[PDB]
């Protein structure tokens, strides 16, 4: 995880972990803006069916 | 009925407040067999048991 410099579309988002002892911590979040479908896909929730 | 988040000491404080109240001579409770199979709940003045 980088706490210095710049990057495009990349953010060190904060979240509290409950799959671990209760604590806040950052994780790298990546956004891909790709010309194509008008639909927005979030794979971290969507898994099909 | 008392509602509140846990670890609030509801039982302890409730008991502490209840212990300060006064009720005049709660009658002694007893069972009286009206037959071989029938039992009736009876109340009596204290000391009449």
């Amino acid at each position: 995880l980088r706490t210095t410099g710049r990057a495009v579309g990349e953010v060190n988002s904060l979240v509290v972990v409950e799959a671990a002892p209760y604590w806040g911590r950052p994780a790298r979040l990546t956004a891909r803006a790709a010309p194509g479908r008008d639909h927005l896909i979030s794979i971290d929730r969507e898994a099909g069916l | 009925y008392l509602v509140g988040p846990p670890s609030l000491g509801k039982h302890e404080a409730l008991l502490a407040y209840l212990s300060t109240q006064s009720v005049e001579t709660p009658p002694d409770l007893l069972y009286v067999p009206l037959s071989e199979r029938k039992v009736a709940v009876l109340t009596l003045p204290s000391g009449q048991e």
């Binding site: 002892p21 209760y22 | 988040p5 846990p6 670890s7």
Partner: protein, 49 residues
């Protein structure tokens, strides 16, 4: 048994030192009743300085 033996409560004095994997206590830490009893986590890491 025609009639069991009734054990009245007593003020406990023991120190319960549970042992388990971090995942083992993850199934118990979810309820708030575990926290109001236990405040002491003896934490072991798989790494040392």
């Amino acid at each position: 048994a025609p009639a069991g033996l009734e054990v009245e409560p007593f003020p406990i004095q023991m120190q319960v030192i549970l042992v388990g994997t971090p995942e083992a206590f993850e199934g118990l830490e979810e309820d708030p009743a575990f926290s109001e009893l236990f405040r002491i986590r003896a934490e072991f890491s798989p790494t040392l300085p």
